[PDB]
Design a binder for this molecule. Structure first.
Ligand SMILES: [Mn+2]
Ligand SMILES: [Mn+2]
Ligand SMILES: [Mn+2]
Lengths: 427, 419
DNA sequence: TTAAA
DNA sequence: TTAAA
RNA sequence: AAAA
């Protein structure tokens, strides 16, 4: 009977990692967790212990040991002696990575006196190594222990998750037999260092013409009044000062979905109805105003992830959505898992500081919610390099690592965004 | 000699609190910190230990002990054997609250060979010996708190140095009193709706419209209609709020919207409009809440500028500054308050992320963030659930208030903060 | 519970 | 480094 | 997983 003992704190991922690596060598498993006590402002980590038992397949070889007070040395010592298994064990391995400082201090010494092979362990979050106290070995688990998106979100209490594959992408369904032509044309301009010029034309005249009153592109009356009120106008900027590579992008859409009417801007007559207007520009405007960039970035990384033996739908995906039980859901543009570190990618074409700054707070908090406190967040913006370096420094929080856990890319990174994501995440 | 040993992690506040309370009873102090080794992704907590020595006035009775690897047991014990003071100490007290788990285990065991251990419970605000409540015993100011978290250039305003008191001098008290009456009479929801329509449809068209008369006159023409709703369907209490403003800073020409003639220059427009629009668009709500909180804390022991203030801004060295609407310190816990008048879920969610992260940066991982919005009760509850994060405690660290709380917001903040 | 403004 | 949109 |  070889027993492995884990300390269940509020970060379940370290215990899942050590469990996945050591279960093959032990016969019994003791999960020490906290009880809920409102009077001392103590919540319970029991939900994580069940998820640890579930996703490690411990079954009845798992012993749950609750602690009444995780900050009282006496109660911890007492609760251990009363509830710790008294069977004669040959080996006792305690990984003291989780829990409070009082938990690790007193559990360790209680099991250092009671015992018989003994070994203390700790998983390093910085360099991904399992350090043994007496064996003096530091084995890396970075490339060996794996985890998929379902397991990772589940042990963090997130259920009902869905996402899109490369083949089931939403705008492929909307632009059948055109999507590849539209996406190949955009990609070529972005790889031709036209990203900056695109986002300027997108701000003016594009967003001046095709944005404003809600349902502007679905009621011809609203769109009629808007173009009249645009009669210095963005229409001439579009008609007369639109560069050629955008004309190539605009003409990549099918004629029935082109924003242009030749080499000028399509304006509906009084014959064109509400549904006619919507069927022409709605999907094309929504794709050009931002959705295209989600697909572009995902397309520039899928090959590099498959080369590293990652599997789509388990280790990367697009348009992920998840939620806790009976709680609102959230959306994440792209997700990636390197070994067992979550990387969440949030995308925007905006170049405006305030908007991107708020995007940064968002992606930081979401990856902590679903991947634990060692996740990495990447924000990709249309800002210049000075603005992106400013944002990283603005939002950086110090956890004890030299490597950044919040990364901002900008408009100068778009043309080679594949390799830059690859270097940031895996190197 | 009686020596106190602290473990310097990346949260310096528990070490300040434990240090403030136990400095009196001890002679020497050992601060065990981490070296910087980029090759193992390990950064140094030396900057925090220096701040601990400075703001606790440890002077030369403080000994910095570095560790080359805070993740490796043997490398720790070695650096502990070769560096820890071998002088004869009659009493040794190790507080193992900070640092990594390896640090607290092997430093504890090292010192036990040569003894008392203590720990500061973040959940019940007590120091526990291997239990004294410090919640109302140890105090800190905004300057000390941000400084130990490495922030500098801290500035903020007082009730009497509020910026808009200098922009509407001889009229701010009437303006603020008018707005407060409307919110005290449960008209917050009505006010919010009128700001969304037609106020922000007229005065928030695009960029720098309130600065260029050409841009403003153009926007007026396209509207000609929210100008009609403004002139005709504006509630009486809102006309009273508008007419409380100085005449050269009024948005209304009599009982109708003012329209600049070609004569009005860019300086004449902005001086008449820009300050008034920005205050009504939402800055008023910052002042309203602050005035209510300063009222409720009139009996408590907090001093303005040490434990609460408005419009806090600070920065790290060579780093961008942030802005925080209101700050409060209860004992040694930072309470950050972000205010918005918006009723929109998307906008209020993004403000929630912001205030959760900011208070964590400047006040440590045990800070409390409060977001005050103009949403209804169902949306505020949904937002609290959406953004909640498990900390180990049963009391919430992210709190959202909505439009129904505006009238009694002073009592609401007092009850949430002081428990 | 679009994306950007 | 507006607060809203 | 460096006041769970
Ligand atoms: Mn699976
Ligand atoms: Mn996005
Ligand atoms: Mn605010």
């Amino acid at each position: 009977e070889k027993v492995l003992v884990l300390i269940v704190g509020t970060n379940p991922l370290p215990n899942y990692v050590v469990g996945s690596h050591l279960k093959e060598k032990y016969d019994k498993f003791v999960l020490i967790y906290s009880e809920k006590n409102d009077k001392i402002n103590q919540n319970s980590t029991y939900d994580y212990a069940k998820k640890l038992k579930e996703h490690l397949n411990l079954n009845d070889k798992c012993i749950f040991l609750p602690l009444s007070d995780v900050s009282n040395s006496e109660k911890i010592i007492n609760d251990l002696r009363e509830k710790f298994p008294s069977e004669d064990f040959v080996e006792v391995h305690l990984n003291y990575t989780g829990g409070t400082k009082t938990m690790v201090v007193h559990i360790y010494n209680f099991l250092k006196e009671k015992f018989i092979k003994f070994e203390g362990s700790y998983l390093d979050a910085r360099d991904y190594k399992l350090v043994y106290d007496y064996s003096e070995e530091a084995i890396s688990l970075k490339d060996t222990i794996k985890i998929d998106i379902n397991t990772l979100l589940s042990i963090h209490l997130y259920e009902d998750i869905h996402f899109e594959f490369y083949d089931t992408y939403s705008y492929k369904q909307k632009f059948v037999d055109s999507f590849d032509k539209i996406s190949q044309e955009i990609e070529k301009a972005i790889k031709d260092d036209k990203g900056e010029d695109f986002v300027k034309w997108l701000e003016d005249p594009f967003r001046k013409i095709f944005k404003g009153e809600n349902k502007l592109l679905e009621k011809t009356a609203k769109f009629k009044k808007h173009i009249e009120k645009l009669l210095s106008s963005p229409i001439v900027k579009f008609n007369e000062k639109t560069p050629q590579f955008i004309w190539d992008i605009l003409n990549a859409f099918p004629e029935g979905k082109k924003l242009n009417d030749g080499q000028k801007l399509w304006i509906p007559d009084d014959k064109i109805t509400n549904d006619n207007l919507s069927s022409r520009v709605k999907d094309t405007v929504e794709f050009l105003n931002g959705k295209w960039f989600e697909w572009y970035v995902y397309s520039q990384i899928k090959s590099e992830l498959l080369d590293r033996k990652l599997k789509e739908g388990e280790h990367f995906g697009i348009s992920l959505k998840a939620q806790k039980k009976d709680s609102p859901y959230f959306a994440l543009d792209i997700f990636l898992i390197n070994g067992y570190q979550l990387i969440g990618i949030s995308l925007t074409t905006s170049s405006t500081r305030e908007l991107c700054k708020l995007k940064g707070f968002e992606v930081i908090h979401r990856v902590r919610q679903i991947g634990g406190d060692e996740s990495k967040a990447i924000l990709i913006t249309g800002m210049d390099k000075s603005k992106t370096e400013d944002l990283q420094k603005d939002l950086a929080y110090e956890t004890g690592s030299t490597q950044k856990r919040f990364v901002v890319f900008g408009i100068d990174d778009w043309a080679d965004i594949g390799s830059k994501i690859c270097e940031e995440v895996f190197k």
